[PDB]
Amino acid sequence: MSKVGINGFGRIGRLVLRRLLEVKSNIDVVAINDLTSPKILAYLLKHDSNYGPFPWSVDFTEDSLIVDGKSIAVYAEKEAKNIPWKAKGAEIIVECTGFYTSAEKSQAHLDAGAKKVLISAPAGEMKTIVYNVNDDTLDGNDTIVSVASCTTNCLAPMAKALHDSFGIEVGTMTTIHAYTGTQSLVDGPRGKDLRASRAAAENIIPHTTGAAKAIGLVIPELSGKLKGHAQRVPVKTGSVTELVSILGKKVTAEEVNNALKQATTNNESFGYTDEEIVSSDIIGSHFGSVFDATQTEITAVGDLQLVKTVAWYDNEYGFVTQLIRTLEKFAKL
Amino acid sequence: MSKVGINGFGRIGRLVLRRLLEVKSNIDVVAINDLTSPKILAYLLKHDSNYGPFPWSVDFTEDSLIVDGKSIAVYAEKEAKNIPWKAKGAEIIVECTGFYTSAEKSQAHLDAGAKKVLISAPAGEMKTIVYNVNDDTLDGNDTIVSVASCTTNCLAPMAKALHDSFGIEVGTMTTIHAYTGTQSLVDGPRGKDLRASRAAAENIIPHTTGAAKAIGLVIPELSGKLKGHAQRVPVKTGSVTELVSILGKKVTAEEVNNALKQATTNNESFGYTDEEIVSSDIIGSHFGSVFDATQTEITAVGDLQLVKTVAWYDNEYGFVTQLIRTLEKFAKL
Amino acid sequence: MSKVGINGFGRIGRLVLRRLLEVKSNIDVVAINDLTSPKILAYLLKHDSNYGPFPWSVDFTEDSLIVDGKSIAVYAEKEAKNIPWKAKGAEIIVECTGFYTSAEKSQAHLDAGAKKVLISAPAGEMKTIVYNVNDDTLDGNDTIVSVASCTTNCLAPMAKALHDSFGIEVGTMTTIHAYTGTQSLVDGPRGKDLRASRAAAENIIPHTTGAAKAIGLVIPELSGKLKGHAQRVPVKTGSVTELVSILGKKVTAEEVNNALKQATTNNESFGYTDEEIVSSDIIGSHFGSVFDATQTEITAVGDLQLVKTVAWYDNEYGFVTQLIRTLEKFAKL
Amino acid sequence: MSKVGINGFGRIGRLVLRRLLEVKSNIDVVAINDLTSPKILAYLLKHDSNYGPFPWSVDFTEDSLIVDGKSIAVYAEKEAKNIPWKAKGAEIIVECTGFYTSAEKSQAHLDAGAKKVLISAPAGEMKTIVYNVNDDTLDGNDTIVSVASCTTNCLAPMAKALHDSFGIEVGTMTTIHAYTGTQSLVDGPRGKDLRASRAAAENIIPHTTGAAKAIGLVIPELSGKLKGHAQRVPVKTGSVTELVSILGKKVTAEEVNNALKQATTNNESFGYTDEEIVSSDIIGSHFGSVFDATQTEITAVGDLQLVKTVAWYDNEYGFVTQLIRTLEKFAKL
Ligand SMILES: NC(=O)c1ccc[n+]([C@@H]2O[C@H](COP(=O)([O-])OP(=O)(O)OC[C@H]3O[C@@H](n4cnc5c(N)ncnc54)[C@H](O)[C@@H]3O)[C@@H](O)[C@H]2O)c1
Ligand SMILES: NC(=O)c1ccc[n+]([C@@H]2O[C@H](COP(=O)([O-])OP(=O)(O)OC[C@H]3O[C@@H](n4cnc5c(N)ncnc54)[C@H](O)[C@@H]3O)[C@@H](O)[C@H]2O)c1
Ligand SMILES: NC(=O)c1ccc[n+]([C@@H]2O[C@H](COP(=O)([O-])OP(=O)(O)OC[C@H]3O[C@@H](n4cnc5c(N)ncnc54)[C@H](O)[C@@H]3O)[C@@H](O)[C@H]2O)c1
Ligand SMILES: NC(=O)c1ccc[n+]([C@@H]2O[C@H](COP(=O)([O-])OP(=O)(O)OC[C@H]3O[C@@H](n4cnc5c(N)ncnc54)[C@H](O)[C@@H]3O)[C@@H](O)[C@H]2O)c1
Ligand SMILES: [Cl-]
Ligand SMILES: [Cl-]
Ligand SMILES: [Cl-]
Ligand SMILES: [Cl-]
Ligand SMILES: [Cl-]
Ligand SMILES: [Cl-]
Ligand SMILES: [Cl-]
């Protein structure tokens, strides 16, 4: 299967395409569905506030985009059941709308004539892959899979290294996270969630995330052992996850950092830094997660020890590189 | 005619209530319509990212707000014609949703039992008032009235003063304007305006406005003599309007500033400053416009002269002060 | 009664005046030292990007400010020993410059003729007060004293309550903190701290703070039990401190929240909220810290329990209210 | 000579070196002077909040940078007359500190052993070059020259084009400009410029600029015929210049646009767009100026006409491409 449709040509959807082209995948994006015109999708693909001009030619007709000379159909169907995926034979749907995050809802793509769906968000109790952590759980028989959230892709590889080297007995995470499209520009209603109603670029905004809760799906041994949340803050992309853990062994910072260094060596999904970087330095990252040895902290009082480990992530592009790695493997099974 | 309803309890609508309590108007707001729950409306009213905590007590029930101890009904009817304005006797509707910006649209509130409608926005060729420029044109027969935009309330008093003192033969305006809820948080579709699709807190974004174009509604002798546009920029509120004019007389800067100063004297709508202020100093202003003498500029070669005059405005609260002066006059006709 | 001098009329030092006038304190501020002219200090006092217009009249002469009709002498001596504090009889110095944060350095004010110094920052091993936590350790003999940081003033009352109710065995803190004047507007050298060189309004920036490390000066039984750091983010003021603890007893969330609530009752320094607030809601707070029951989290596995507690603080005005409470007491001893 | 030194390794100084490497220049940067250590300079060069990772290797020793394998000497001499430019034979100094913006001040570099200085800012009455507008006025005997400001490089080619096609009789300019390091992060003294004291990322801040006033240095026929100013706003780089002119002929929008379009054809310095861009789309531009046809406006009343023309500019990288074009020519004369 080398035929993809993108449902939801948003921040993640457009970057899926940009990254497919960047790595010369033999995947062919043949169709896109959204809620707008080809003219507007083309404007948006061409001009990006976070990543700058598209590196390839972009043009449009009344029913398509022309991206680096290839035609991609554009549809505007509110309900996935009505999307004509059969029309151009879209086999694998990259589900990036946020509105189909369960096997029940993403079934509508299959009903509509697609074979597989890769959901770009947590999608409940289904297979949930962080590339280079648990992508060997994938088989030929899988039809609807999740690559979880940006935060899950940041946390999982750090948690996994810690769990493998030291054991994690219990832990809590806080991500200091760039604001996203689910939040508000000015204070006003945003469904039921009171905090999401507040002006995102003018506030620190606590926010729920399931990355830690649902880590069970990626790292089965940590199931139920982690909790966490986010503080959404006014940067446009680039985020950082802090994990505070009780480990199964007494450790030093040096030891922790060496264990992480090993886990990131020749690891295309998981990077390492001992440089004094800030969030803008992670924009454009090709990793799902970048461990930052400069922020490691061990608080010890006798036999008790809290270990804080910190990893950066580009919640847009960095996450997308993990989505594509997983897509490329999903496509070959 | 002292009982009011607010349709659209947004940036403008919530501030309408705040300003009304602040000046202890004899006007009572007896009902609110929006699209959400009293809980959410009360949360937004209590906590404001731009003006801080509401200065009175705020609580709610399943169908009401309780503000400063007074009960205000809350309805959630998306079509104005369905709002049960008669239940609490709402007579004047302050229309702040953005969705009824015409006589044809806003007459739905009359169908729904109200007596008059004041529209918080330009609304085509109906009676349109900038308080202390043309509120003397209001009469007993006016049933649907507009107060034009924030930008109109800024531009008009400056243009009026220039018109009366010197003549404006032609002019062009640029307002450098705070972002608003019609813009986008992250890059993505925002109706059909391509620029409006771009991340508002991360861009200078050219934006069309009608303030100059429709100035004839407020200053009839300047009908068709002005054009202009906006540059939307990343401040939360607070804006500034520049007008470049060919006047009907040769002038000096001191002479323009003195004329403006005279027009702002005992003028509750139109302030003056010669202080080196910046936009956050205008937040919370009780004027619709504050002329800034430090920015006046006369550019002349022989008989060819360009005059640049600049005024600040808090496009949320300052505009709201104008809306409320207009409302209090409208209610006593 | 007591005559005060302010050294460093910056963000903090200006708000010290504002808050003293706001509470109608008996303290008279008779002198200010900074590095600039009365005209510039008057401009800055009058117009504040975070708190708006000064609530009292502000004027200047060539050597003073006139504030609400009262004269305050202005000096510009970069070395504190050259400040003529005796000329106006300034007895208590509020040291707000950043450059005299030790007993040895602040001694220069005593040499220059002041009697006491209160330093608006950590200042090594001196008496270090968080009002309503340990202000009872002050006595008539103290002549140089610290009120620690904003973060300490947020952290200490929350750590005190947890300590008093449950014991803290070990803990780690992260504060997501507004940017301040120690940081950089654009990427450029900023002393020796590499991360402080980076554009503050455009980045999440890891940053060291001694709040947790030196907490033993305020709560001696927690000496050595806490560590932490900051992430500096693009909000202009308003900050939040998370603390992850192992406590000496097993607990529920409700139980933690009730203990904190009791601790905040009739506590003018330490507030409580169960509302879904965001950082701009803390701006202008009259508390040093506001505990947020909505963010409390207990992660538990077997007999292991991590407890996350979170408190907001207005690192500018809120801290200042603490500084003023301490100042009022220190001046009467 | 082809050996260059940079004085002021700031936003402009560092981008000078990046651009020199990017276009594979002949020029050999042999020395840098600033105020700090090689370590700090290396960190700043390597990590850039606006343009991302340096595309070449960066290391340092105690007295040098090593960039793409080449050693560059670092000095820390706050007075230019003391910079030891003869040690590595720097012949042309790119003066980017902002402290030597006159002939008399930059003479210090010649006293210090250099032959020529190119000042990255206006510097009074000396040859002032906007590349592809008046670079042919440079000759073999010029030793101190200016490239003016970012704004000048944006305005001049638009003005030149309008002047050549229609005549400019008189005109006034407003640039909506990214904040820069001359401004303040938080409200605090900034020399004598009151508006520069105010928090740059939280305000619209009127600011003077000589772009229009000194335009006669670049286009002598326009001397005295233009004036203008800036509004500094909260975007990190990327700016826009609006010019309102009385022209020598009556025109249509299409006529202005086609004339501009012709002046931009095969012009490496002056670009054209008819796309609906916003400021972030100009970041990384290799033009000094990009004329934007979508914003052209003609306001006409009988006999009279005002013509608004607008061009974007990356006040950092864009301007730097102009500086480098000029430097390459200067070095070969
Ligand atoms: N932004 C991030 O940092 C991030 C990171 C990882 C995962 N995700 C997830 O990826 C998904 C997309 O997030 P995003 O930031 O790209 O959101 P977005 O809001 O930028 O994009 C959503 C796109 O889907 C379209 N859309 C909405 N409803 C639709 C429908 N019914 N049919 C077709 N198109 C529809 C919108 O028009 C838009 O173009 C979400 O599930 C999100 O949780 C986002
Ligand atoms: N924000 C400004 O600077 C400004 C200044 C002057 C005028 N205005 C105008 O005032 C009006 C409101 O602007 P705002 O900035 O407060 O917008 P907003 O988006 O903050 O508020 C609109 C409110 O109306 C509600 N709403 C939307 N459709 C509705 C419907 N059918 N029925 C009931 N409620 C509905 C929304 O839920 C929201 O609470 C617009 O016409 C706008 O142009 C805005
Ligand atoms: N969030 C906060 O801003 C915050 C919170 C708590 C404590 N503090 C502490 O308060 C102090 C001041 O912080 P700020 O944010 O007000 O800084 P600031 O930079 O806004 O103000 C410092 C003032 O000191 C002046 N100054 C510098 N050197 C001087 C000298 N040698 N003599 C006299 N004046 C001098 C400056 O001109 C400026 O007006 C620091 O110790 C800081 O850590 C700050
Ligand atoms: N930033 C822009 O948008 C822009 C555009 C065009 C021109 N310019 C001009 O270029 C010049 C530099 O601007 P910038 O934005 O790079 O400034 P900046 O503040 O980023 O850089 C100035 C550099 O000079 C160093 N410095 C200061 N005084 C010094 C001295 N006496 N000796 C040696 N080094 C010293 C600083 O440490 C810093 O690294 C200014 O003249 C400015 O007007 C700036
Ligand atoms: Cl469906
Ligand atoms: Cl959780
Ligand atoms: Cl209706
Ligand atoms: Cl117009
Ligand atoms: Cl506008
Ligand atoms: Cl620590
Ligand atoms: Cl000028």
Numbering used by the authors:
A (entry chain R), B (entry chain O), C (entry chain Q), D (entry chain P): 1 to 333
The authors write:
Glyceraldehyde-3-phosphate dehydrogenase (GAPDH) is a highly conserved enzyme involved in the ubiquitous process of glycolysis and presents a loop (residues 208–215 of Escherichia coli GAPDH) in two alternative conformations (I and II). In the presence of inorganic phosphate (Pi), GAPDH catalyzes the conversion of D-glyceraldehyde-3-phosphate (G3P) to 1,3-diphosphoglycerate (BPG), accompanying the reduction of NAD+ to NADH. All the structures reported in this paper have four subunits: O, P, Q, and R. Each subunit contained two domains: the C-terminal catalytic domain and the N-terminal NAD+-binding domain. Two anion recognition sites, “Ps” and “Pi”, bind the C3 phosphate of G3P and inorganic phosphate, respectively.
The apparent KM value of the wild-type EcGAPDH1 enzyme for D-G3P was estimated to be 0.73 mM, the Vmax was 0.272 mM/min, and the Kcat was 224,926 min−1. The KM value of EcGAPDH1 was similar to that of Cryptosporidium parvum GAPDH (CpGAPDH). However, the Vmax was 171 times higher than that of CpGAPDH. This means that EcGAPDH1 may have a higher enzymatic activity than CpGAPDH. Amino acids Arg11, Ile12, Asp34, Arg78, Ser120, and Asn315, which form hydrogen bonds with NAD+, are highly conserved in WT and the mutant binary complex structure of EcGAPDH1. The overall structure analysis showed that the catalytic domain is an open pocket with positive charges.
